[model samples]
Target: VKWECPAGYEVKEGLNVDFPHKGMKRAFIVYPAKNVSGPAPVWVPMTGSVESTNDNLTVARSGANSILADHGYTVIAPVRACANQDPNIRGERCNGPGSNGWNWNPWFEGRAADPSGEHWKNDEGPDSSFFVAMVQCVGTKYKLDARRLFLGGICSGGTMTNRALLFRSNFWAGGLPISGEWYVTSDDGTPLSFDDARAAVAAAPTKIHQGRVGPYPLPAKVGPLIVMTVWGGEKDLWNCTRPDGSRFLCADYRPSTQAGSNFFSAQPDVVHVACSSTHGHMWPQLNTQEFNRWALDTLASHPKGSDPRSFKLTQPPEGYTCHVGPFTGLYASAWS
Candidate 1:
């Protein structure tokens, strides 16, 4: 199936991207960097849950991905495999059933072990393979600065960004994760409610469990990596659901953001920054275009194989605030 892209944007129609999966079909859109001279950095921007191929492209072309592409960064927008496409993979989700095959049961990523069985051994799984495949596929088509691969996304996509960076650090240089998950769970692996998760962090950040992956603050030795964690303030929350009319409350994002910051910063080799704003659950920056530019510029300055300790954030733009992590400078108290 051929999916159309916006004018001047290149398209790679649905592909049987079955690497590391039995029968998973996915598609991607490549918005090449404008007026770029040499190998340019690639930005992978994912959206919230259950969006179709068209919706993914719409977000890619019209949102921050577009801004990254315009700022001399190649943006590769990917389509998620639908949930109903495989009954065995219960962790997947749906956009909806549709007339065209592509829109049927649209899906999103599984970052936490919420519905469980997703966090595989060594953090390698179907979605991680998709991440590698998408980047390698784009590399074959575009001139890439191999060391400068970066990732950013919103909501479920944001959680996916954190997951990718956590496991696939060697493949990506820097990350811009907006409201990503820390996969907070009980010591016995039960997913916690919003208040439980938040209170867990408020009490002991390191004591929190990743729900699926044992201890939350386990040692991850990947070096040469940096991430800018963007929080959408007190209102950044969502109701995480499965297909069986069962769901979990993710009504607060601050704990996850703080947990994620602590997780990444605990590693001496990784750089973490917490950025926040009052924009609720959406992208926090009011100057959407400018914020995108500023974040990408800072992220682009650091590449894979570079020391994270040497990395420094660039100047802050309007309607945004950030702090270098050890979990400092986040909006910690009195948040709803």
Candidate 2:
């Protein structure tokens, strides 16, 4: 995995995004030089669970985030915590079969109990705080525009990105979650309908039960102006099964991409791009880059204070199998 910063962009690693969490939250930033006019737009390229390194952001020969950096955008890749980093915290690591660490809990289950199995904890609340602190710290340190921040993630990182959209919607200009979907599961691990999940969340207790962290409040609502471009593989397996023999996606499960687009479309400028690949639980490099390009463009077109509902879908290329999921699909050769 080769990583490159564009000709004019510079890369910095190991910067701490300080928070009230137990472990250090670190990130790497790739951005244009200081001479560039005003604060540059920021892009966060998040890696998957075990692959929680800056190197996992590769797209074409160059890193996918370079697409944003080349356009004078500041790209930030936060190295999510892994089992190697924290044996107890489940911040962004996918904790299941095929996952790199212990399989004691679901990816969404807040955190492992403190040593003993008696007292469960809440890692996500602190993790979300780290995200905000990352943006603020980087924005002030680099003199970048905090409001223009965008986030992109793969796998577990992508799932966390969606969670951010739901939990920390106001912090980002938009988001791109590759091969990820939105929807909370029932206690039995059954995936709920988007509408059902949305309603549940809306009425959910201020102190939502995150595994065992009681008194944890839900984050703000989704802003009508937020733009979310979801990229996914058509043949990607929806094979997440939990305890109690329940499937995350049932027999009538729509493609994860479709499920995601439907979920975000109601309040966001959402677009779903389906890649034509059977790569089970894998990332589509080219398709992801395509979506990021569009997401950046959309951000440029719709600045802050612009009408939230005035957003239009980006068009998909001709001769590709496209669907009207929330917004239009910007199809590529490899994408469906």
Candidate 3:
């Protein structure tokens, strides 16, 4: 199904044939307004776990992807496979370790086994390659600027956005992973590994995990790469700063704050929040337009794979009061 396009724009539909993973993978490509000049930029926004539908134009619309279109960006929303449902090829599976195979893994982690006939697992899907190929194909078809590609998503989709930053940072200028937190390991003490047990042991840290809102272990090496703007709400239930200055989560998940901190520690990162709203675990509507505008400007300045100036903060708006860490910006820290 097609979403309402902004003036001077039209929608194109297509499927993934070159990097096919799930059966009949599909996508919605929204072109920029015709009157707009030049080979437009590409903006990809993914749907969250719950909204992971085969028909994702609606979710893209709900996420205000049209805002990018209005600004002359070509918006592409691929129909990701939902979990265990018919035609559900991509969902939360791509959001975690080995969920998407060789090209995808947990944060700071790479493929568990090699694709070149080394220790291999047949169960894993080719999601990472498929996604990368999808973007490349669309960009080529639309003649989009290679340096002007951007990503944005909410919830679990937000998680994948950050994952792309870690694995596919070279391909994107920047991304906005709103309300998404990073996870390092799996339950049952499974570790993050690329080659084998030795690789996992070498990379594993003493504090190997994080509760939501806590800090995650930083990767050994990160490239001078894309800028990321992350967001979470004061009332986000998935992550909480407890009274004792400890980070707590509704689940025994990895550290949310630490994950954000570790991620920002590597790339040029900016953390912000919707201090006045209680939109727990979802993208905040307040100041979203402002956020996207800033994102576009930031990406334009950095271009593809360029390092932005050292760490910075986007201090709260003039009338808004700022809080300490946890609810604080920069990296996640709970103020006393």
Candidate 4:
């Protein structure tokens, strides 16, 4: 059965934000729970694939929205486009590619194959604008604490999230890119090529994770934003190895190592945390409650005019525990 918001929380709006590209509308599941006499925080999750499975949407329900709602938070889960093609997109023969055999490049990551099979929309596309606009739309309805407005996703959705923060730094305070195949290229310092990007991501340094890491030091050209890294420790990537025979787990793809090379990489401005779970290719299950609590609480703690440094990254080593059963599929409970 689909999960519902637990007691002490109320649904805010089942909004459908319009998007011009691909001639479609995106969905946002907004839950505005009562705040405990304090300002509320908002978390926007972009899913991994654009299929609209509503699975992660359901898992996100467990992460922070319902939990924070219990403690008083206004959470919004925008069902952004993903690999999952919505079955309702058309009346007949609509599952993936939605009647159009070509892929709908929602994120416009430049790598997306051109639907026209001729020329891609190489120019700056509306993917980021559409997302930022959703953020604006959410802000218009709620008195959002900008300092605490957090964004996150799993796998490809998480990768899209990294792109989101890179392009729309003005909209969010921090980022939580979980299960992110954090690829790099110009986003780091290397040229925009697969080989160079892989080298850069592989070379990045891991932050001595005491608690959580925040994305900051905004690339020299990008202005300022806050970001943090959270991942399921037992993810599939954990046990993977490099071509040169190096373990990718824990020490691989260090945030500090890569963030330092870029002109805007905020090496010292992040908090890295390892979620205690062995779920492959899934968000941390053991610390779902604590994850949401930390996200909302951190946002509430930050002041409007305070410097990014003033924003503390608290890492609780033993915050909570997980009930990880045997994996049914690739992802854990969140995606099930």
Structural similarity to truth (TM-score) of each candidate: 0.77, 0.61, 0.60, 0.61
lDDT of 1 by residue, 1-336 (tens): 112222343334333233233356555557888889988888887765544434443443335455566679888766655543332232244432222211112222333433334334244445656767667766655677888888877666676677677677777887887876665766555667557767777777543246322223344476567788888776777766646878666457777788778777776667787788878776654877777888888888777776766787776787888877744544344453
lDDT: worst 10-residue window of model 4: 207-216
Which stretches of candidate 2 lie above 4 Å from their native place?
1-25, 33-35, 50-52, 58-63, 83-124, 186-220, 238-255, 268-281, 287-291, 316-336
* Candidate 1: residue 203 lDDT (0-100): 76
Winner by TM-score between candidate 3 and candidate 1 = 1
Residue 332 error for model 1, in Å? Answer: 5.5
Models sorted by TM-score, best on top: 1, 2, 4, 3
Candidates, ranked, lDDT: 1, 2, 3, 4
By lDDT, the best candidate is: 1
Q: Write the per-residue lDDT of candidate 3 for residues 15-54, one digit (tens) a residue.
A: 3322333454444444452345776667777666544434
Report how far residue 304 has shifted in candidate 2, in Å.
3.9
Q: lDDT (CA) for every model shown?
A: 0.62, 0.46, 0.45, 0.44
Clash count, one per candidate: 3, 0, 19, 28
What does the lDDT come to for candidate 1? 0.62
Task: Kindly list the per-residue Cα lDDT of model 2 for residues 2-119, writing each as its tens digit.
Answer: 1222233322443433222345534444455233578777777766544434445444522355456766677666545443333223334344542222122223323222334222
Task: Tell me how far the alpha carbon of residue 15 in candidate 1 is from the true structure, in angstroms, after superposition.
Answer: 9.8
Positional deviation of 303 in candidate 2, in angstroms? 3.0
- Whose lDDT is higher: candidate 2's or candidate 3's? 2
